[PDB]
Design a protein around this ligand. Structure first.
Ligand code: YHV
Ligand code: SAM
Ligand code: ZN
Ligand code: ZN
Ligand code: ZN
Length: 239
């Protein structure tokens, strides 16, 4: 099919022109962090600073043993490893090399541009953060408009991320009943964010997918075309 790279979305003019020719997805507002529709001392880890030779050797500053990494909290600028800290991936946009592609029936999708090792950070899922009332309001709005794609993601109690109008290329990852990625909820400056992380080695060219768990709403449920042997048949939660 037709494909495009993440830089292609930085030009709002070349994009809208590309969209008309079915060589890029529909236009949306690109944002680099969540936008809270309604608005609702710090502790650094105890990792030992890495030596000049240790970093050169290929040692990880704030690796698997980091106090913050083990609670899925990112370190701040005030980390003892400073610049070298590998636990600031959201804040530094340390995203994987991914392309936006057209699938057969699922609309647009994400694929690995290179081989992606297991538990690699893909993309932060950014959008407008809604409460339970605002979310339910917009499902009815989107249903009335007769939208085909829905871009809701559960963040926490009374916080749902909506990437329908505003977000980034994370909003193109499709559901699979047998996924190669998962969601991980991460704390940055006392605030919870959600990103996609590989659960296995994704070969270059392979579509990136996660298991979208979300409580179903309404009578009609979207059919699943993920093509897996164990396909649940529909997107979301049991009922
Ligand atoms: C981020 C992401 C990745 C991959 C995915 F597959 C998804 C899917 C969603 C998503 O937001 N789905 C919506 C959840 C709320 C209920 C929505 N229903 C759809 C039909 C029904 N009617 C219009 S109705 C009222 O006519 O029954 C309402 C579906 N997000 C995804
Ligand atoms: C967050 S959007 C993903 C990007 C979407 N394909 C697009 O073109 O904008 C989720 C929507 O994509 C479609 N979708 C995602 N995964 C799917 C799947 N496994 N089977 C069928 N449709 C899927 C559904 O219409 C769903 O509401
Ligand atoms: Zn640390
Ligand atoms: Zn750190
Ligand atoms: Zn499926």
């Amino acid at each position: 099919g037709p494909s495009c790279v993440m830089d292609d979305f930085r030009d709002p003019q070349r994009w809208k022109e590309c969209a008309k020719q079915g060589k890029m997805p529909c236009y949306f507002d690109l944002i680099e962090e969540n936008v809270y529709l309604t608005e609702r001392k710090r502790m650094q880890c105890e990792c030992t600073p890495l030596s000049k030779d240790e970093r050169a050797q290929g040692e990880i500053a704030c690796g698997e043993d980091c106090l913050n990494r083990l609670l899925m909290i990112e370190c701040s600028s005030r980390c003892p490893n400073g610049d070298y800290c590998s636990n600031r991936r959201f804040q530094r946009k340390q995203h994987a090399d991914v392309e936006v592609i057209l699938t057969e029936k699922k609309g647009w999708g994400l694929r690995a541009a290179k081989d992606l090792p297991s538990n690699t950070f893909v993309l932060e899922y950014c959008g407008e953060v809604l409460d339970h009332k605002e979310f339910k309001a917009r499902v009815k709005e989107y249903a009335r408009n007769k939208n085909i794609h829905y871009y809701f993601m559960a963040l926490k109690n009374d916080e749902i991320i909506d990437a329908t109008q505003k977000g980034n290329c994370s909003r193109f990852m499709n559901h699979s009943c047998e996924p190669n990625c998962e969601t991980q909820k991460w704390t940055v400056n006392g605030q919870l964010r959600v990103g996609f992380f590989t659960t296995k080695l994704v070969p270059s060219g392979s579509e990136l997918t996660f298991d979208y768990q979300f409580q179903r709403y309404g009578k009609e449920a979207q059919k699943c075309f993920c093509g897996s042997a164990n396909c649940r048949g529909y997107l979301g939660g049991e009922n």
